[PDB]
CSV table of C-alpha atoms and ligand atoms in Angstrom, one decimal:
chain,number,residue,atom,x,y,z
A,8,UNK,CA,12.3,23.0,17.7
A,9,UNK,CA,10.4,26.0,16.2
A,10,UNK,CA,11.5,27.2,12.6
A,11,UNK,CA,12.7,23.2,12.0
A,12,UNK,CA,11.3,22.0,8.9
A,13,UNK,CA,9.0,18.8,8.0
A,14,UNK,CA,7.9,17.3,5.3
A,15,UNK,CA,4.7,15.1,5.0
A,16,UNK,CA,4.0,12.7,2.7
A,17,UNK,CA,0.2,11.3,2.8
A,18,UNK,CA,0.7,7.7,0.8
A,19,UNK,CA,-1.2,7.8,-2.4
A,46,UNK,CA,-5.8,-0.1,-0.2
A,47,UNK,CA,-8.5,0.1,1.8
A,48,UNK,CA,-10.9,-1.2,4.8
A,49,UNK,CA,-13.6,-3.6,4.1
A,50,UNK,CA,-16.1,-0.9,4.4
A,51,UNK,CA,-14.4,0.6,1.2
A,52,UNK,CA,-12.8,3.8,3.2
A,53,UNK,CA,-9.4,4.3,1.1
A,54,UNK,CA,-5.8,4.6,2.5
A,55,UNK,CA,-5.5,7.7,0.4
A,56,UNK,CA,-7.9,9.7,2.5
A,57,UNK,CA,-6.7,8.3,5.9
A,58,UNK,CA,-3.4,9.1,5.2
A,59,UNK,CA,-4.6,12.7,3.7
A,60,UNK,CA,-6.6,13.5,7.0
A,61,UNK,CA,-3.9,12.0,9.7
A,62,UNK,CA,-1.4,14.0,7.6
A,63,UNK,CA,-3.9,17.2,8.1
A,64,UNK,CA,-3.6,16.1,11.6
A,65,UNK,CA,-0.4,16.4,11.9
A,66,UNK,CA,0.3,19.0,10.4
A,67,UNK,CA,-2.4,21.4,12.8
A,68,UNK,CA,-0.1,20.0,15.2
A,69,UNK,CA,3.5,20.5,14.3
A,70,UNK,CA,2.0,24.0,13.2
A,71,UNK,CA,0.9,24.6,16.6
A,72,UNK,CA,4.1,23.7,18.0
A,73,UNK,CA,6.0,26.3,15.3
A,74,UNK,CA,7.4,23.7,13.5
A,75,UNK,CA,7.3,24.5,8.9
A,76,UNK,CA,5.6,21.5,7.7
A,77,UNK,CA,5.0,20.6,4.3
A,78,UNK,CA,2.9,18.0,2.3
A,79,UNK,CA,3.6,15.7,-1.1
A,80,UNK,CA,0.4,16.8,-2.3
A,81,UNK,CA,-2.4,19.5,-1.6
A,82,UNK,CA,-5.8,17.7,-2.2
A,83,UNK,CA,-7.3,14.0,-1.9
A,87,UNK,CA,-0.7,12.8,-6.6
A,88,UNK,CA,3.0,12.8,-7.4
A,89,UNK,CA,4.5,9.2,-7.9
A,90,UNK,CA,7.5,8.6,-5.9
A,91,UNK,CA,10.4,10.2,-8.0
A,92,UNK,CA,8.8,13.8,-7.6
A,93,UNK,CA,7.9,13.4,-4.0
A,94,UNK,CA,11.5,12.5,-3.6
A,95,UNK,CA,12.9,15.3,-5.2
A,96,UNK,CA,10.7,17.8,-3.2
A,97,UNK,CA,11.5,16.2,-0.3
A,98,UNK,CA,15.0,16.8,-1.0
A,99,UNK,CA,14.8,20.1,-2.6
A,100,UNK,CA,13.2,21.4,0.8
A,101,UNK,CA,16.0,19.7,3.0
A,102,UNK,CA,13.7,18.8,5.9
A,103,UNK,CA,15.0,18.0,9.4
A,104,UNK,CA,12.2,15.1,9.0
A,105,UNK,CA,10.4,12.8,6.3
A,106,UNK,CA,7.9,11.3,7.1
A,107,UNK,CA,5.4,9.0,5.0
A,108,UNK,CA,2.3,7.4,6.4
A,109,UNK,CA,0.0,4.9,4.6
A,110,UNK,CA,-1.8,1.6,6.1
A,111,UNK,CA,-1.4,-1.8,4.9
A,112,UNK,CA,-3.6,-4.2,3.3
A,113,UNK,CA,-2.5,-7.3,5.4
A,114,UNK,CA,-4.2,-10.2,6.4
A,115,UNK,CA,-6.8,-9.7,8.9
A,116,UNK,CA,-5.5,-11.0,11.6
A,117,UNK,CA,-2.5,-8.9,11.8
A,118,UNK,CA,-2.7,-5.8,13.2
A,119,UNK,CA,-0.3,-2.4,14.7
A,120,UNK,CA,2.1,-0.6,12.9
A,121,UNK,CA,5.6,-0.9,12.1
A,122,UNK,CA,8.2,1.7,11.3
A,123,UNK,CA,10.3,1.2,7.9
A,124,UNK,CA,13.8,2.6,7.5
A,125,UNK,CA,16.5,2.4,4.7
A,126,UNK,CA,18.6,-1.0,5.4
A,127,UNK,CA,21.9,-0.9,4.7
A,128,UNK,CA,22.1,2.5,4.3
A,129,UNK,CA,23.1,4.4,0.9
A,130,UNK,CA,24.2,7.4,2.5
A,131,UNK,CA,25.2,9.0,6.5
A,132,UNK,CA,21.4,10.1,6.9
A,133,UNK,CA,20.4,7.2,6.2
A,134,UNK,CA,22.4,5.5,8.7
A,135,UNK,CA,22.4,7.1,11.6
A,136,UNK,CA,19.6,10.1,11.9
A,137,UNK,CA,16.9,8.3,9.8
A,138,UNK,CA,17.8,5.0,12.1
A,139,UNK,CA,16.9,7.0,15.6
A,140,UNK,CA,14.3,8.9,13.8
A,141,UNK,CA,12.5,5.1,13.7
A,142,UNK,CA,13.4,4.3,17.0
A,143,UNK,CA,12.0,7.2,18.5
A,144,UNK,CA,9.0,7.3,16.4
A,145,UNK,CA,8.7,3.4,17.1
A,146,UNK,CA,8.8,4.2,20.8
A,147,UNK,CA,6.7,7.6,21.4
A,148,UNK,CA,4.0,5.2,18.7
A,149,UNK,CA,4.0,2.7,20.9
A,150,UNK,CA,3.4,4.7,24.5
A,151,UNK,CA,0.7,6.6,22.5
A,152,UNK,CA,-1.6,3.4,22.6
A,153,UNK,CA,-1.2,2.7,19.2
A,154,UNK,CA,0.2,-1.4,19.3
A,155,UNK,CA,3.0,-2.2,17.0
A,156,UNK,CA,2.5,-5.1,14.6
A,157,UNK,CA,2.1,-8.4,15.2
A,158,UNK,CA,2.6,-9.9,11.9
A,159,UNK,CA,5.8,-7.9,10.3
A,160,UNK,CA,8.9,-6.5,11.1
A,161,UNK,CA,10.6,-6.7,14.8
A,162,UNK,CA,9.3,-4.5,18.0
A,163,UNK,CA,7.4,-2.2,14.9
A,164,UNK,CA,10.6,-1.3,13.5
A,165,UNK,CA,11.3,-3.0,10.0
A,166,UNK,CA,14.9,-2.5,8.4
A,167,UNK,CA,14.4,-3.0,4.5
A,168,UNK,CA,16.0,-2.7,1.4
A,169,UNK,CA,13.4,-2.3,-1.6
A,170,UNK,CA,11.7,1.3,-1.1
A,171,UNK,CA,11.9,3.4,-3.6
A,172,UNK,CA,11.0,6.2,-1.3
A,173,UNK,CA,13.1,5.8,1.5
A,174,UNK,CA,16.4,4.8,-0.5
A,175,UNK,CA,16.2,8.2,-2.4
A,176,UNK,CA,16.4,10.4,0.3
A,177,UNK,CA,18.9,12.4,1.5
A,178,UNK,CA,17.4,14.1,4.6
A,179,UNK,CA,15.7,12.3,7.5
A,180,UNK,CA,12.8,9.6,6.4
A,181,UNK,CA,10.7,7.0,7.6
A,182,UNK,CA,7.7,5.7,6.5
A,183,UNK,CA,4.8,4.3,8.5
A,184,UNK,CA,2.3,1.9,8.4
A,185,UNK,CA,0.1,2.9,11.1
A,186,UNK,CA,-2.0,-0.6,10.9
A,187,UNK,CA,-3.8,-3.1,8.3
A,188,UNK,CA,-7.0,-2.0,7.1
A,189,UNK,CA,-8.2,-5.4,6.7
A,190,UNK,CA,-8.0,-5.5,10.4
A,191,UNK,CA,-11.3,-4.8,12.7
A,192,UNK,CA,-9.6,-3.0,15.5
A,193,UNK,CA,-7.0,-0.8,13.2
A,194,UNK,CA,-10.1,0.0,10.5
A,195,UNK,CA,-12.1,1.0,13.9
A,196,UNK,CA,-9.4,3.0,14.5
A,197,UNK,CA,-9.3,4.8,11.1
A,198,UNK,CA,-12.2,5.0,10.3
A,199,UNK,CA,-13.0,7.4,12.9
A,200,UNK,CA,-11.9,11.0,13.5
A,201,UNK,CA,-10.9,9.8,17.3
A,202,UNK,CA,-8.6,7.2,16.1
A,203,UNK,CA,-7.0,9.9,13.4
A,204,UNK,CA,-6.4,12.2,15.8
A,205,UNK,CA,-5.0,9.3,17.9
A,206,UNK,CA,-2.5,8.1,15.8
A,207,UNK,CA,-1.8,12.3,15.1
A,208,UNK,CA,-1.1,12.6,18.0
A,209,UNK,CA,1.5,9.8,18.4
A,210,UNK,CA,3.3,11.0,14.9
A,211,UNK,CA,3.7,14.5,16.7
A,212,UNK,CA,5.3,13.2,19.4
A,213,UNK,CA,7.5,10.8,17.9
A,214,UNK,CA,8.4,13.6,15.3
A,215,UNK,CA,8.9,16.3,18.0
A,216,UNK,CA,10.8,13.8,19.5
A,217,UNK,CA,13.2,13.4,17.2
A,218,UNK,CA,13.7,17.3,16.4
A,219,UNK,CA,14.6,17.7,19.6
A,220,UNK,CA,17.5,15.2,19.6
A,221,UNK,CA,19.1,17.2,16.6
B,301,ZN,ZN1,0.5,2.7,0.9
């Protein structure tokens, strides 16, 4: 999988101690990124500091023509619902879409999952989530998902965040769901 190429895309609410999705997203991207690295893969991110809206981040997605996509953020949920789910273009606008972007969230669902990171309780189905109105992952032509790694209005996922463990935690799982899927292609 070395010389494959990735594209991160750190999203941008926040946890009721006021630490923003922007920076958790920006440091577990960081993450991520040290790790593909490590493992030779080219990463690259939708911005360099802690932003585009989602028509440029599209288009350099695209313009690179990454093996992978992948967008994190963290909802803003009610607080009882907590995990992550896995979001993917449904019905498909183009082949990418509907087959490679499909196991990419399936994979990534999975490796999330075996990492210790529970999918949610309150959206989607088995932390996947099929759906129709993103912008983000409608436009693209390449491999793309985008996760929500948990609700910050949650105790447990803002416990998570709000550490460096729990970054590198959920880092962790993203690398191995996105080696994961290289490795299938
Ligand atoms: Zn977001």
């Amino acid at each position: 999988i070395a010389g494959m190429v990735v594209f991160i895309d750190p999203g941008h609410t926040s946890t009721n101690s006021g630490y923003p999705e922007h920076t958790f997203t920006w440091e577990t991207g960081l993450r991520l990124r040290a790790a593909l690295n490590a493992l030779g893969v080219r990463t690259a991110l939708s911005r360099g500091n802690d932003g585009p809206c989602v028509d440029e981040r599209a288009n350099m997605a695209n313009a690179l023509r990454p093996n992978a996509i992948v967008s994190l953020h963290a909802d803003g949920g009610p607080a009882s619902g907590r995990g992550f789910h896995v979001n993917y273009s449904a019905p498909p606008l183009n082949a990418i879409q509907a087959g490679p972007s499909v196991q990419f969230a399936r994979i990534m669902r999975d490796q999330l999952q075996a990492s210790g990171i529970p999918k949610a309780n309150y959206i989607g189905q088995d932390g996947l989530y099929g759906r129709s109105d993103l912008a983000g992952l409608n436009l693209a032509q390449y491999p793309s998902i985008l996760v929500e790694l948990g609700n910050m209005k949650n105790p447990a996922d803002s416990a998570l965040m709000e550490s460096a463990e729990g970054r590198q935690k959920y880092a962790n799982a993203l690398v191995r769901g996105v080696a994961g899927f290289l490795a299938t292609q």
